[PDB]
Amino acid sequence: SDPSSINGGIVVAMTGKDCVAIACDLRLGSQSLGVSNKFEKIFHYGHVFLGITGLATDVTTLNEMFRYKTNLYKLKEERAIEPETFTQLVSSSLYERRFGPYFVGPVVAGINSKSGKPFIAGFDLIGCIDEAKDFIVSGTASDQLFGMCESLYEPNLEPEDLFETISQALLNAADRDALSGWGAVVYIIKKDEVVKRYLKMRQD
Amino acid sequence: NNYDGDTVTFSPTGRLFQVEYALEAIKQGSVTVGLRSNTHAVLVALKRNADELSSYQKKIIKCDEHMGLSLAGLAPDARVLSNYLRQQCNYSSLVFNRKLAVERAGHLLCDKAQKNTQSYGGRPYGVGLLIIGYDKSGAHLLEFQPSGNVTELYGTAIGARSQGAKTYLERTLDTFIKIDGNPDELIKAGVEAISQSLRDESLTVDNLSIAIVGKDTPFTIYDGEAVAKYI
Amino acid sequence: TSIMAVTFKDGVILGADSRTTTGAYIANRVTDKLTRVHDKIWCCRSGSAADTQAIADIVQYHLELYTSQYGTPSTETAASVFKELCYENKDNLTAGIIVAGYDDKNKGEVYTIPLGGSVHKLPYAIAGSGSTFIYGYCDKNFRENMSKEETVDFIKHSLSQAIKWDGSSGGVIRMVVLTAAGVERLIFYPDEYEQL
Amino acid sequence: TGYDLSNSVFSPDGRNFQVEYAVKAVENGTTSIGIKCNDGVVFAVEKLITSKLLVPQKNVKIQVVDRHIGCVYSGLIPDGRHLVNRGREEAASFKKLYKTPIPIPAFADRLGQYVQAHTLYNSVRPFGVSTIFGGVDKNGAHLYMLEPSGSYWGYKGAATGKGRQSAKAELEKLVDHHPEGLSAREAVKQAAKIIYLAHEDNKEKDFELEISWCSLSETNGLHKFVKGDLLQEAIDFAQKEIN
Amino acid sequence: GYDRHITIFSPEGRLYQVEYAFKATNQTNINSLAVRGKDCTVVISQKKVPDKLLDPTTVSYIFCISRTIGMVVNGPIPDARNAALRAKAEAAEFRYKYGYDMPCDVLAKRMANLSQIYTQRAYMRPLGVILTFVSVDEELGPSIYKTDPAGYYVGYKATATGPKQQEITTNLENHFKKSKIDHINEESWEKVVEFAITHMIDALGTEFSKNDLEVGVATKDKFFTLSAENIEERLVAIAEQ
Amino acid sequence: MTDRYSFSLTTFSPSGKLGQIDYALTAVKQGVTSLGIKATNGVVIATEKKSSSPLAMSETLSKVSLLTPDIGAVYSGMGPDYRVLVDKSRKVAHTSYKRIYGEYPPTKLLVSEVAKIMQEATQSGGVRPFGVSLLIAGHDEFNGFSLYQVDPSGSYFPWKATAIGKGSVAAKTFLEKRWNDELELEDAIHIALLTLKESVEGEFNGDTIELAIIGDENPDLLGYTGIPTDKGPRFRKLTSQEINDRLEAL
Amino acid sequence: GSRRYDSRTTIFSPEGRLYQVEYALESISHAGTAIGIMASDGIVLAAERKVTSTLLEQDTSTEKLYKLNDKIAVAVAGLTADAEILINTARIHAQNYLKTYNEDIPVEILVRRLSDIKQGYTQHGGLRPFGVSFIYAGYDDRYGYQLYTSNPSGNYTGWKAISVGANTSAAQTLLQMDYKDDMKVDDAIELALKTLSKTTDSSALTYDRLEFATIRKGANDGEVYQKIFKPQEIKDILVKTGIT
Amino acid sequence: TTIVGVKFNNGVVIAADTRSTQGPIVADKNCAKLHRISPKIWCAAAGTAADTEAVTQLIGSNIELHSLYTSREPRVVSALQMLKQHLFKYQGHIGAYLIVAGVDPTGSHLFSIHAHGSTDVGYYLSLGSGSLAAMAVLESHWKQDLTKEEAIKLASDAIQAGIWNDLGSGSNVDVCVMEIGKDAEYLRNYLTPNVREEKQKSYKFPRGTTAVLKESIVNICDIQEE
Numbered sequence A: 001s002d003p004s005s006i007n008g009g010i011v012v013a014m015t016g017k018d019c020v021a022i023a024c025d026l027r028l029g030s031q032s033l034g035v036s037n038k039f040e041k042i043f044h045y046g047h048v049f050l051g052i053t054g055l056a057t058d059v060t061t062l063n064e065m066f067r068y069k070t071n072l073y074k075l076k077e078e079r080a081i082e083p084e085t086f087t088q089l090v091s092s093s094l095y096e097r098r099f100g101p102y103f104v105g106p107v108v109a110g111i112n113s114k115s116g117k118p119f120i121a122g123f124d125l126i127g128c129i130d131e132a133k134d135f136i137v138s139g140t141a142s143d144q145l146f147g148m149c150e151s152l153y154e155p156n157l158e159p160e161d162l163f164e165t166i167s168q169a170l171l172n173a174a175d176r177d178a179l180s181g182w183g184a185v186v187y188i189i190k191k192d193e194v195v196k197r198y199l200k201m202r203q204d
Numbered sequence B: 001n002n003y004d005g006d007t008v009t010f011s012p013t014g015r016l017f018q019v020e021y022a023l024e025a026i027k028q029g030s031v032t033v034g035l036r037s038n039t040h041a042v043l044v045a046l047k048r049n050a051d052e053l054s055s056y057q058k059k060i061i062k063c064d065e066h067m068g069l070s071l072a073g074l075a076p077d078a079r080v081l082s083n084y085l086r087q088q089c090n091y092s093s094l095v096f097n098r099k100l101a102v103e104r105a106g107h108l109l110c111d112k113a114q115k116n117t118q119s120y121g122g123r124p125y126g127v128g129l130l131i132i133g134y135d136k137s138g139a140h141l142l143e144f145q146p147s148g149n150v151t152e153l154y155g156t157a158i159g160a161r162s163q164g165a166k167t168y169l170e171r172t173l174d175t176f177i178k179i180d181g182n183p184d185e186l187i188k189a190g191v192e193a194i195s196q197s198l199r200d201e202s203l204t205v206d207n208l209s210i211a212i213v214g215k216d217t218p219f220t221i222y223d224g225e226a227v228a229k230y231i
Numbered sequence C: 001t002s003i004m005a006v007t008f009k010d011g012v013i014l015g016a017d018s019r020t021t022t023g024a025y026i027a028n029r030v031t032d033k034l035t036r037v038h039d040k041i042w043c044c045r046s047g048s049a050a051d052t053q054a055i056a057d058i059v060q061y062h063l064e065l066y067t068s069q070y071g072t073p074s075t076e077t078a079a080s081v082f083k084e085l086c087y088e089n090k091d092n093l094t095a096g097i098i099v100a101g102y103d104d105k106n107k108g109e110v111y112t113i114p115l116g117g118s119v120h121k122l123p124y125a126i127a128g129s130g131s132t133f134i135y136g137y138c139d140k141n142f143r144e145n146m147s148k149e150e151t152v153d154f155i156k157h158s159l160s161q162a163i164k165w166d167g168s169s170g171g172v173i174r175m176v177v178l179t180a181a182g183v184e185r186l187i188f189y190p191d192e193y194e195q196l
Numbered sequence D: 001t002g003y004d005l006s007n008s009v010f011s012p013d014g015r016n017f018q019v020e021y022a023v024k025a026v027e028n029g030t031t032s033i034g035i036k037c038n039d040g041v042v043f044a045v046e047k048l049i050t051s052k053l054l055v056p057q058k059n060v061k062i063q064v065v066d067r068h069i070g071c072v073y074s075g076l077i078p079d080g081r082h083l084v085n086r087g088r089e090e091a092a093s094f095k096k097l098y099k100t101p102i103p104i105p106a107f108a109d110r111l112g113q114y115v116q117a118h119t120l121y122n123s124v125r126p127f128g129v130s131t132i133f134g135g136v137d138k139n140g141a142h143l144y145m146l147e148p149s150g151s152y153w154g155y156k157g158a159a160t161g162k163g164r165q166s167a168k169a170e171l172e173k174l175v176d177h178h179p180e181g182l183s184a185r186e187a188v189k190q191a192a193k194i195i196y197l198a199h200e201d202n203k204e205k206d207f208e209l210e211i212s213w214c215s216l217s218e219t220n221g222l223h224k225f226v227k228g229d230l231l232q233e234a235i236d237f238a239q240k241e242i243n
Numbered sequence E: 001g002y003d004r005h006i007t008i009f010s011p012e013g014r015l016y017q018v019e020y021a022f023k024a025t026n027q028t029n030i031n032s033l034a035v036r037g038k039d040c041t042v043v044i045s046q047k048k049v050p051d052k053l054l055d056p057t058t059v060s061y062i063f064c065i066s067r068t069i070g071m072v073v074n075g076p077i078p079d080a081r082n083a084a085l086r087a088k089a090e091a092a093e094f095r096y097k098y099g100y101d102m103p104c105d106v107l108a109k110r111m112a113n114l115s116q117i118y119t120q121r122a123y124m125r126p127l128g129v130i131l132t133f134v135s136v137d138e139e140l141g142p143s144i145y146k147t148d149p150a151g152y153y154v155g156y157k158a159t160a161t162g163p164k165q166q167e168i169t170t171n172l173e174n175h176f177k178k179s180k181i182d183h184i185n186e187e188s189w190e191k192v193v194e195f196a197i198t199h200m201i202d203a204l205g206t207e208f209s210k211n212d213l214e215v216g217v218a219t220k221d222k223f224f225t226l227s228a229e230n231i232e233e234r235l236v237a238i239a240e241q
Numbered sequence F: 001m002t003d004r005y006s007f008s009l010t011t012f013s014p015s016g017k018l019g020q021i022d023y024a025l026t027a028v029k030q031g032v033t034s035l036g037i038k039a040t041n042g043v044v045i046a047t048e049k050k051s052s053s054p055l056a057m058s059e060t061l062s063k064v065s066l067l068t069p070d071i072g073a074v075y076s077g078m079g080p081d082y083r084v085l086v087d088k089s090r091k092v093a094h095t096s097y098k099r100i101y102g103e104y105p106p107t108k109l110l111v112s113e114v115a116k117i118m119q120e121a122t123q124s125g126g127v128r129p130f131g132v133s134l135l136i137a138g139h140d141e142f143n144g145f146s147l148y149q150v151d152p153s154g155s156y157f158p159w160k161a162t163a164i165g166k167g168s169v170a171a172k173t174f175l176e177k178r179w180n181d182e183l184e185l186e187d188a189i190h191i192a193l194l195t196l197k198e199s200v201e202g203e204f205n206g207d208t209i210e211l212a213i214i215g216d217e218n219p220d221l222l223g224y225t226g227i228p229t230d231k232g233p234r235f236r237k238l239t240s241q242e243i244n245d246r247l248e249a250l
Numbered sequence G: 001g002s003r004r005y006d007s008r009t010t011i012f013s014p015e016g017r018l019y020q021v022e023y024a025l026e027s028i029s030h031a032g033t034a035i036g037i038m039a040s041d042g043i044v045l046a047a048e049r050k051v052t053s054t055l056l057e058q059d060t061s062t063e064k065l066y067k068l069n070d071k072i073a074v075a076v077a078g079l080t081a082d083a084e085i086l087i088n089t090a091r092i093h094a095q096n097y098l099k100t101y102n103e104d105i106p107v108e109i110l111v112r113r114l115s116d117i118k119q120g121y122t123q124h125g126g127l128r129p130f131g132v133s134f135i136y137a138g139y140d141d142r143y144g145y146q147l148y149t150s151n152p153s154g155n156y157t158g159w160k161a162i163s164v165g166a167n168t169s170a171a172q173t174l175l176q177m178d179y180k181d182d183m184k185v186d187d188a189i190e191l192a193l194k195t196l197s198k199t200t201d202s203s204a205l206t207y208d209r210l211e212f213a214t215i216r217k218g219a220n221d222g223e224v225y226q227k228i229f230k231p232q233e234i235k236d237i238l239v240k241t242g243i244t
Numbered sequence H: 001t002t003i004v005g006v007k008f009n010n011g012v013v014i015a016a017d018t019r020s021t022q023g024p025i026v027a028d029k030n031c032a033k034l035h036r037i038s039p040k041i042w043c044a045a046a047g048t049a050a051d052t053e054a055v056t057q058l059i060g061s062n063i064e065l066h067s068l069y070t071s072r073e074p075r076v077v078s079a080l081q082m083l084k085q086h087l088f089k090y091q092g093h094i095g096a097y098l099i100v101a102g103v104d105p106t107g108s109h110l111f112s113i114h115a116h117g118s119t120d121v122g123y124y125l126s127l128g129s130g131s132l133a134a135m136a137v138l139e140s141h142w143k144q145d146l147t148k149e150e151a152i153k154l155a156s157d158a159i160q161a162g163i164w165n166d167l168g169s170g171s172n173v174d175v176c177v178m179e180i181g182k183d184a185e186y187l188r189n190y191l192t193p194n195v196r197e198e199k200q201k202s203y204k205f206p207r208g209t210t211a212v213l214k215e216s217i218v219n220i221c222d223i224q225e226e
């Protein structure tokens, strides 16, 4: 009944020293029934990464919508959209459905190509922006992720340390949620290289 | 000349040529006569045929139990206007339980015709109407022209050669107005009036069309052997 | 809310309390419920603050535009514009408005417009939650053609009682005097009116 | 050239020839007048008796708007009726919103703006009427006259149609000879005389006199038609003055 | 030659209908003048009542748009009243939406933008009027802003409009060349009206009675028109010095 | 009371000419000279304040208009057409950009939107083209400084420097000789004043000339402090005094 | 009424031609020449700019060659403002197709859509047609490399090599002479520039007068790259082929 | 949320806390609740966060266009009127509760506006869940003729009352001062009385602690040449 917890799932993002990390679980279900263990929730438009939790039809629809909009942006502007600008585009797009919203919890992550500055942001379903320095959490295990992040996180972590922190934050939060888990992916993002890692986690 | 392309254009002398051309269609139409007394009102119409195989075009239309008209000019425009009158008569009945006054019926036709003379795209109505009726103030006869001008009269005629019947009625005025409580004598005076507008052709059984409305008489149309009495 | 408008010999006086409430919390204790729709046509507002402001703003607009075209509107005309809004939007509004104004021809006039959108021309009017407690008092003490000082005392004593008994009413007693002389604003504080 | 073929086109003069052509239709029509009196207004009109078959007193030309305003016009009669129908809608919406009946100056601008709107586009034709109208409001009596252009002013006396010059001359005498003012009953008599004098310009066909009036004393500030004895008294006065 | 009937460009880059609307402006044969004092803005206009049958009190080309804004029109009265009604509506709507009185210059811009639309859109004709807006604005002080059928508008130190505008314009130009200031250095509006009438008399070369003139005065927080007796008081003071 | 002009008033003639666009360009030719010059660290736009009367206050008529804090515009041709275009240009910068992306549009895209509005007047029903050519100068983070011309057709071209209107042929030749890719903003203002003196007949001073720059960020003109990223408008209109100072070193 | 001033843009002549389309084509014949040449391993788009001024900022300028998506580009001949209206519509159509099917739009489908829009202006609405002719250069996995042209009538056709705008008669003769089916991109580049060099109304063909582009399946690991040539790169390819 | 506005001698000051919450969870610890409508018109927001941002940006956008159209600096009453008419139209469904303050050519102003579209005038105002705690402080310490320094002090004390006593409010105090004839000064994190203490332990993991199945490079670049 509650659209935000039919399919389940989580996204978490963190900043480090000259880097960001964004991670998500792979589960898609119909309440108790697990259906897919390959349903990725992180997409990218150029160098800007977008994680989306919530109702899976809206996750897919918004991915297709932001691909559409960032493609046209690029043709007209003659450059890739930056994370700060994309954040505003996500907010605008969500708020224009104020009274019939997409049931989602988006998370933007990326490095501004000009300034080199690490950037993350989170949103509610109607487009309010939380632009955090430290970390952003989203999904059915958001309480669990908040607890893990708030204890495990420290600022200015190197990419390969930040990988361990975000992975342990996701995995342990997912294991305390019935509707999250079934695999996990972690993107480590630096100014001009991006490493993607699939995590081994318990499959229940 | 240059000012007759549409109804929205005045000529330099203040004339509306499209309205005057619509007026011309009435003069080409077949003659019809209207007249009344204090008790009854009568329409008499000379119907026209295409040839000997064809029927004679109907000239008289019933609008309500107490009101109807005869036409001269474009018959489809008479159908549009009579249908409008039927609806307005009907609205007066359903909403107010009130038979529509004949004077008010004229005012409604005037205003309907007028809108077509002031706006672009539309055209004036190409037909003249003689409305008879009996309401709360007795018998009435109206003449409608598609300029919008509506006129209450004791008698009149419109169509081709209508000036002959109109002169007769102008002489007979004092006689036929007094024909009260005698429908057959009032029709006789109407049939004698329309005879003044005839040339070559004469009034036959399927040529003539008569209608009457009065005090204890609903609007009824007489055609065929029903009018043989008056020939 | 406790509001009233009273006609007297020289014109009309409008009076009101100054309290706005969200449940039992007093959101505003110095509210001005006496509002100008024209130079000498004012209204008393009760009910929803948002609704009455929205209506009063629209009425002020309509009468400004009336004045540009046709000169000064009558108090009856102002009451009619209030009515038209309150009646036609009765399903979506909670507004109890008293309209009061001064012409030189008609002198002081008071019109009350309750929830339904009906209009009632009266010598004086009372409205708002606190008015229930002063129907008795106002009926016994009102006279026609009172002086300015008598009418100020009549409103002061009346709203004092309305305030005393109604929790939804309180704060200061504001008044607005409408005569040929002009527009006078009066204020009366708790220490003055509570001891009456 | 071609500037006169379409409405709303300025000629090189700065004129709208279509509006000037509408005036010709007005000049072609029958004579109608208005007289402002002490506490009201009087309207009168020439009705040409085309035929004996016309029913006397039936084809009424003067029209009432609300209960306090009279309207009369010369030119295309249907155009006048269209304008009065609009006038009635304007007066109704005014009374609906503001309660009071529409003031005469307020009413005058409602017609004026509507007539003027029919000189703004080529998709419509200007009005082929000059309309004389007025009545009694809270500020007293008001008489107006409104042309095809949308132009209107207040008047002491007004006249339009084929007999307008004759009428205007007679109205000008009344203004000079009665500076303190004219009574309502006097104005009815004078209105009859002026229509009779103005009938020399339409002298071929005989005519029918029609008068109406609003007066604060004589009609309680409501529009009424002059009927029966008071009409015949005005006709007799008019018949005596021409002889 | 249909480029002369509607508002499209001629080969010369001209809009003939706009130019012909400017000529309609002078059809009334009335001259208007506007000047600014310290505390006020005065506008005067010729009043011609040719017909004795006219009610002279209803013959006017000065309009009270809002409490603060007055408008004098040079052009035919139907277009003048069209413009007046719209300006009144616009001024009232502005107050409702934005919570303060519409400034004189902003109304002038708005009316000029509307006039521009008639020069670009074919179905609407230009109004054959020049609109002179006057006020004492709460920010800018005494203000004169004038609109025409082209959709042009600008602020003025003083201005004149009509058949004999150039004669009035040069008369005013020469005064401000002497005084070397943007206004009439005078405390009372009464003396600023006297200035306006005096300099119109000098420029036009005609004397005026009380019924030949029509006066509008803008002060802080109101605009009002003078009665015939208020003008007579002005004319007496001019003659006595 | 109908808009029946649902058909184009600009059509192709047998020769392939769009007559109304050509005639609009003729109206632009009659209009007063305006110009734009691009420097390395700025852009300058300038024009003559042709006063219709000496009683008129020419300060109230602004030929050079701010569109966004970093974009300015000037014109040659019909002033009323320009005024409504500026209103629409300011609004479209918000509706089709700032309300979506939370930042002002880059110069080229705002130009593209203005161009679109002018193209539509060249094809839509019942309208004539705009009788103006615009010069739009602006700055944005990723494109840097830029200067664009926009014609009645809707066509737009980027320029290093150009002129439009009355004496544009002569003025463009003057700019070809003086312009180089190493100009500082002060050098461009100097060249702008020299170029504009040729096309002006009468008085030549800060009161008869209107000149604005797209230059450095002006934090003093921002109106508030406390947000490090908001550094102030790059658009600045030069004062009457600031112009006269540079006319002494001319 | 308004009928008086209606040009009637969507009617037949007595001969059965569309007046406004024919006159729009006459407009296009004066525009700067644009050439498209299709090879086995890519497509070339070459086009001549119309407004030679030394003060025109060329590196930030775009009047001829526009990008529709990553796989499809167009060369314009005619009114640039008209072309930009259509280009933005075509860009949207491509993204609507991508959103719907999750596949890049096939070239012909995009071309047909634009051509159908142009057709509509010739049959209804009473508006003037778009005074634009396009050369579409594109790739998809069905037909591979494709060249099309569309004109104001809304008719479109496919080509191995084609010109639009000025001197097309002369340009098409020269292309028909030197084109062969086994030709490559580098050879097609040379043919495109040589054809413009001979047909141009200017005294000499220079880098500042040209816009140039290639679509190659000669990207890293079997992908398709759109290269819009920079001014310096056009200057280099002019020296390489031996024109300057 | 705790938001306040306090009038002083030559202007107006507004303040707010920096916590946003969903249920009992703190979503953001350093929220920015002071919104710029125009350079010298700012407002503090409470209620639904997306709504307050959207409503201030829309009115701020239209105020900017109005300011350009009229060649005048924007007025607080215009922002007030545009906000209330918009909120009234949406019948309370746009959950924006705002304290609107500023300076303009007319003077200094302080208003509140509620979600249903009612507005109020005052010398001191508070809104949000911590408004009762803030209003208690304001009712105890406010006086007429406050200086700038006294008004900032009073405003921040009123926010602190909300921070400490209301669970809906917390973290830091943001202030904006708008004085007549001066630039508005936005003081982000004016007070910071809630810094977290050092943790007892570091939770940095040894590298290789997490089990991995697959690694791959992600292509973020465009299609390459040659």
Ligand SMILES: *[B]([O])([O])[C]([C][C]([C])[C])[N]C(=O)[C]([C]C1=[C][C]=[C][C]=[C]1)[N]C(=O)C1=[C]N=[C][C]=N1
Residues within 6 Å of the ligand: C001, C002, C019, C020, C021, C022, C027, C031, C033, C045, C046, C047, C048, C049, C050, C052, C128, C129, C168, C169, H114, H118
């Ligand atoms: B009064 O109590 O009726 C008063 C009149 C209003 C014009 C200030 N109404 C209110 O205070 C209403 C509640 C109410 C009380 C009693 C009867 C009807 C309604 N309050 C509000 O409208 C309100 C409260 N807090 C914020 C905004 N609006």
Ligand SMILES: *[B]([O])([O])[C]([C][C]([C])[C])[N]C(=O)[C]([C]C1=[C][C]=[C][C]=[C]1)[N]C(=O)C1=[C]N=[C][C]=N1
Residues within 6 Å of the ligand: A123, A124, A128, H001, H002, H019, H020, H021, H022, H023, H027, H031, H033, H045, H046, H047, H048, H049, H050, H052, H128, H129, H168
């Ligand atoms: B304050 O407490 O009023 C505050 C003001 C806001 C401008 C930051 N409100 C909130 O933080 C609201 C509370 C709320 C919760 C649920 C429904 C409506 C309002 N929170 C949010 O708007 C919120 C919470 N999580 C994510 C995004 N937005």
Ligand SMILES: [Cl-]
Residues within 6 Å of the ligand: E109, E110, E113, E114
């Ligand atoms: Cl506007």
Ligand SMILES: [Mg+2]
Residues within 6 Å of the ligand: A174, A175, A176, A177, A178, A179, A180, A181, A182, A204
């Ligand atoms: Mg689990």
Ligand SMILES: [Mg+2]
Residues within 6 Å of the ligand: A203, A204
């Ligand atoms: Mg399980």
Ligand SMILES: [Mg+2]
Residues within 6 Å of the ligand: C163, C164, C165, C166, C167, C168, C169, C170
């Ligand atoms: Mg109490």
Ligand SMILES: [Mg+2]
Residues within 6 Å of the ligand: E006, E007, E118, E119, E120, E121, E122, E123, E124, E125, E126
């Ligand atoms: Mg036009």
